[PDB]
Amino acid sequence: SYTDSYYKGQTALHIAIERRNMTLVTLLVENGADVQAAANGDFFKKTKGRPGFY
Amino acid sequence: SYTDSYYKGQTALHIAIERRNMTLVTLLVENGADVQAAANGDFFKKTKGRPGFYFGELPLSLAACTNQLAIVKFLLQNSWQPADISARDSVGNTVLHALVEVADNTVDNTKFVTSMYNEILILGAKLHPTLKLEEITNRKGLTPLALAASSGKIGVLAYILQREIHEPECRHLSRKFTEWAYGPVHSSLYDLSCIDTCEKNSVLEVIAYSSSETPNRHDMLLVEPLNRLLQDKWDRFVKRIFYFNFFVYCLYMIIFTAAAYYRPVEGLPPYKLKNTVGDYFRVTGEILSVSGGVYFFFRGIQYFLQRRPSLKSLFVDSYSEILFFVQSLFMLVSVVLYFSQRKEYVASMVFSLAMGWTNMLYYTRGFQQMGIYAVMIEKMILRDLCRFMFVYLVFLFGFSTAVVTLIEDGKYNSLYSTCLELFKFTIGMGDLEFTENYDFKAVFIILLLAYVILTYILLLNMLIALMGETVNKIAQESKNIWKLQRAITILDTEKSFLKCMRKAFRSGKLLQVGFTPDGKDDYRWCFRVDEVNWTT
Ligand SMILES: C=C(C)[C@]12C[C@@H](C)[C@@]34O[C@](Cc5ccccc5)(O[C@@H]1[C@@H]3C=C(COC(=O)Cc1ccc(O)c(OC)c1)C[C@]1(O)C(=O)C(C)=C[C@@H]41)O2
Ligand SMILES: CCCCCCCCCCCCCCCC(=O)O[C@H](COC(=O)CCCCCC)COP(=O)(O)OCCN
Ligand SMILES: CNC[C@H](O)[C@H](O)[C@H](O)[C@H](O)CO
């Protein structure tokens, strides 16, 4: 995962879903990926004066 | 080959390329035709006041300008007589300069010229990897980017600043470098070279100090790297310096007003100081006021010498500098009359004082809300009143001298008094009090009522309709005008800066590519931008 303050909590499952890779999503879920991890970095949070993706 | 003064230098290779005949071009190049002949006749020069076809005077330039890529590859690659990609004309314009010149900010032209530019750069990298075409300046010292910025070619500028090539062996020609992308957001680097710090002629200098005829003077600042640069420079350090300058100017005008109001009333200046508190503070205020006048005087001279504006556009741009300079001139004339022992310095001082307050409006520029008023005042004065003065003075003088001629013995028997009263009538504060006993009273009344109907009702409302139309013309353009003024302020604050530092860079001198055509690496002062776009 990303341990920094900006992408805090992003993991491979989020990247798999974002890339629209159904197979990789299926594999990661099969292999015990956490389907309730919270990606709560500043890039991912609600904000006004900064680009991001909430 | 044509030998006249109109088609000087035109030859068969030009005719073959112009006619788009690949076979004839191949044969002519085979037979030893000169692939770098200069057709520099008056038909072929860069000019506006004569019909012509300027293409850069060279067959390679002609081929590129006419959207004939195959001929370009033939001329550059063919071994019978290869063409030099970096050749220049009499103006010094290379193929890229010639390509810039033939833009016209239309969709299809943008597609053609952008395509041909991209292909030529890739081919130039392949043929001469150590050659840097984009750094060659024409006779006026302009690179193709600077020439594009000056000419207002929005398409070419937008292409170049956002250029990206996903291909090895030419990737070092890219300027936009995408580092990552997420769903709606992507982060990229922008090359930034010769935007801020070129030492000769940067893009921002070219856009800001353009002569107000440039077709897209204000739209060019909306192109993404420039907009982010100006916002970053504003928020980083420039905003504080601007507010500090505005505050200092306010203090200066307060001191000047206080000193001016408390002038001595006794005759025959200059006046000698008494050992009393009020005299010390008054003289201190006077010294500060004259100091400020001298400062603005030399700033004005420095501006005019650096810019060298023409008479035709002296006022169209540089309105604010002219007004600050005129304030300085009134202050200096006041000082001269003061030490020359004349009362008339009061008159000069007063005008400067009045100007000193209204020039405060210069500082409302750069606010999104408020700068529109300064702009509207400028345009109304420069266009509507200056054009309307001729018409109104024709009416004023006509009826004025008519009435003076009619009347003998009275207050309406001199040009001064009658001109003043007719002006009062025009702005709706006359009297019309037809109560004097004098001859030809009926004709007098007919003249005066005709004047009132013609100037008060008709001409004055004509003027008002025209000014209102002008305001509604630029109610819409506030957003762009604000940005342009902010850009000019940022550059002016950069130039002086009064600290001996030139920390005008944004982000680090980062390795961009690392892989030049040679074994070296390029560090290029890249600037990071995280853009967001909700398309799809
Ligand atoms: C140099 C010029 C062109 C000018 C200088 C003086 C005489 C001026 O009158 C004019 C002519 C004039 C006089 C009277 C009514 C209308 C126009 O317009 C300006 C000039 C015009 C103005 C009015 O314009 C303004 O709103 C100030 C101003 C507007 C926009 C700005 O960006 C700005 O930045 C410095 C300043 C102020 C005066 O300088 C002033 O204070 C006095 C006493 C007369 C005004 O002459
Ligand atoms: C909006 C578009 C349409 C606008 C139409 C304009 C209508 C304006 C009418 C104004 C008429 C005012 C006439 C002035 C009267 C006057 O002041 O008196 C006059 C003075 O003589 C004259 O000037 C002749 C009349 C002037 C001709 C005038 C077209 C007669 O003589 P008395 O002085 O003895 O009057 C003794 C009374 N004290
Ligand atoms: C108020 N007495 C007359 C004024 O001096 C002035 O001439 C007049 O009111 C305006 O034309 C109307 O606003």
XYZ file of N, CA, C and O and ligand atoms in Angstrom, chain B residues 434 441-446 449 453 457, ligand 2:
78
model
N -35.038 84.951 -19.998
C -35.176 85.993 -21.016
C -35.875 87.213 -20.427
O -37.063 87.452 -20.647
N -34.418 90.252 -29.843
C -34.617 89.259 -28.797
C -35.230 87.982 -29.346
O -34.944 86.890 -28.843
N -36.088 88.092 -30.353
C -36.722 86.900 -30.902
C -35.703 85.970 -31.543
O -35.738 84.751 -31.335
N -34.778 86.525 -32.315
C -33.758 85.702 -32.941
C -32.850 85.100 -31.893
O -32.406 83.957 -32.026
N -32.532 85.865 -30.862
C -31.738 85.344 -29.769
C -32.397 84.133 -29.141
O -31.747 83.111 -28.906
N -33.700 84.219 -28.888
C -34.415 83.112 -28.260
C -34.437 81.905 -29.174
O -34.310 80.766 -28.717
N -34.645 82.127 -30.468
C -34.687 81.014 -31.411
C -33.345 80.314 -31.448
O -33.271 79.084 -31.443
N -32.820 78.325 -27.999
C -33.616 77.108 -27.908
C -33.168 76.071 -28.924
O -33.215 74.872 -28.643
N -31.982 72.322 -27.793
C -32.532 71.091 -28.351
C -31.440 70.289 -29.038
O -31.422 69.061 -28.969
N -30.598 67.811 -25.640
C -31.452 66.657 -25.859
C -30.750 65.648 -26.741
O -30.677 64.462 -26.423
C -38.912 68.603 -28.364
C -39.100 69.047 -29.814
C -40.219 70.078 -29.932
C -39.870 71.322 -29.131
C -40.718 72.500 -29.583
C -40.238 73.748 -28.856
C -41.393 74.510 -28.224
C -40.799 75.606 -27.353
C -41.802 76.733 -27.174
C -41.159 77.872 -26.404
C -41.808 79.176 -26.832
C -41.308 80.256 -25.894
C -41.498 81.635 -26.497
C -40.898 82.706 -25.576
C -41.929 83.736 -25.124
C -41.285 85.088 -24.871
O -40.323 85.132 -24.194
O -41.828 86.271 -25.399
C -41.801 86.433 -26.800
C -40.472 87.035 -27.265
O -40.440 86.990 -28.670
C -39.984 85.800 -29.267
O -38.994 85.282 -28.895
C -40.744 85.154 -30.419
C -41.140 83.727 -30.057
C -39.953 82.763 -30.135
C -40.100 81.602 -31.120
C -40.040 80.276 -30.376
C -40.039 79.108 -31.355
C -42.960 87.304 -27.294
O -42.732 88.663 -27.086
P -42.729 89.214 -25.541
O -41.360 89.339 -25.060
O -43.213 90.588 -25.457
O -43.606 88.204 -24.583
C -44.347 88.760 -23.538
C -44.471 87.758 -22.396
N -43.392 87.957 -21.446
